[PDB]
Symmetry: C3
Subunit: 169 residues, 3 copies
């Protein structure tokens, strides 16, 4: 478990630097918003990976670090959805909520596994906003009659329901 705890540094160190290369190149007139979203999806995936390694080793210095990254990634995701919702890019908004819903499960998968109920409600708080937000977006997509984006909105409403069941069981 010595090198296994050490091997986590290479990914976390490279990712924290890789987040900056995309966080500074996206403020200039160059990079689009959607490329940063995939990085957020990459961040929550690392948070989930750190959670799966921390269960075997039981290192609380890594479960909390996965949650710190997960909460920071989910919080940034909600803002990007809010920013895109006024501009009319519905594909980007639904891509952001999918990131938020998945990030809630990582927070749940951690509180229930660790036992700390301090954040077990906070996963629901993120997930509750997504189900309400996508439902409002689904009706607008249903009203506009744009089926390609509307069909994708249904996938989020279904995938959000899977998270709600997992936080109770």
């Amino acid at each position: 478990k010595e090198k296994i705890e050490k091997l986590v540094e290479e990914l976390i160190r490279h990712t924290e630097e890789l987040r900056e290369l995309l966080e500074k190149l996206v403020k200039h007139g160059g990079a689009s918003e959607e490329y940063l979203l995939e990085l957020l999806e990459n961040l929550v995936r690392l948070a989930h990976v750190i959670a799966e390694v921390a269960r075997e080793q039981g290192n609380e210095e890594l479960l909390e670090e996965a949650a710190r990254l997960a909460e920071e990634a989910a919080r940034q995701a909600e803002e990007l959805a809010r920013e895109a919702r006024r501009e009319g890019n519905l594909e980007l908004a639904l891509k952001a909520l999918q990131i938020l819903v998945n990030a809630a499960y990582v927070l749940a998968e951690i509180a229930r596994d660790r036992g700390n109920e301090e954040l077990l409600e906070k996963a629901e708080r993120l997930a509750r906003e997504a189900l309400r937000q996508v439902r409002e977006i689904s009706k607008r997509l249903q009203k506009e009659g744009n089926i390609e984006l509307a069909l994708k909105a249904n996938r989020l409403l279904i995938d959000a329901l899977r998270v709600l069941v997992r936080i109770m069981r």
Copy 2:
């Protein structure tokens, strides 16, 4: 909770899309993508019916309705020559079999396990028959992707065979 609103509302998206595919309004693939969402909802309901039978029966009625629509639509695309849509539609039946098995095998309905097992074998046979044609027609891109379906279809039989 919310599952009542979604099952009705998602079925409502099925009704608007079932008439636009019949009339000229909808390309078949857009109707196909909804089926993938339909089978996905049934599995979510199945995990809810365990942790929380009236929902298990609703998931099987809803899931089976997606599998039946897939086999019939697959036959139409198989006869028309559009093989890519036929292989994509046939996958929906394979995907629907796991939802039906996990819902029959965990509900004791032994007869429903016979219908779940039957669909994947026929789908695997149809996809195997579709796989052979793609090798002869020289279409390599669709043939290997069709092979991935036959491999992933075989996985369904093992999950329904080991648990028997």
Copy 3:
């Protein structure tokens, strides 16, 4: 004879995939990689079938399919890294990294510390190769592939932790 009719269906898949292996190796580029991704999935499926029926010969066939994919994948990764085709190189390591999990899922259930020792080398070497391309891609002003290279390094670290 439960696993008797299943072992017949699995024989067809190993033969049909090996038959498709000759057609895709004879035309020669990325489509050959797609065969590896489709092939390694069969190795994991056959391994889960051999653990269920206890057939050791199916383990030998499952390891044969898995092991040849890692050798075929690593060579293209070295070739694709030098040709500038970095997207093709990243796909080869992704196929290479995923194939290592099949060896672990096999070795521990088969009990072979020689094959289990070699798997760790494959995932660790690939992770550094994915890391080395990530650093080189970071120097190139292309962020998009760096995102995909970064995702592999995350999944490469995930596989290495379980194989230990």
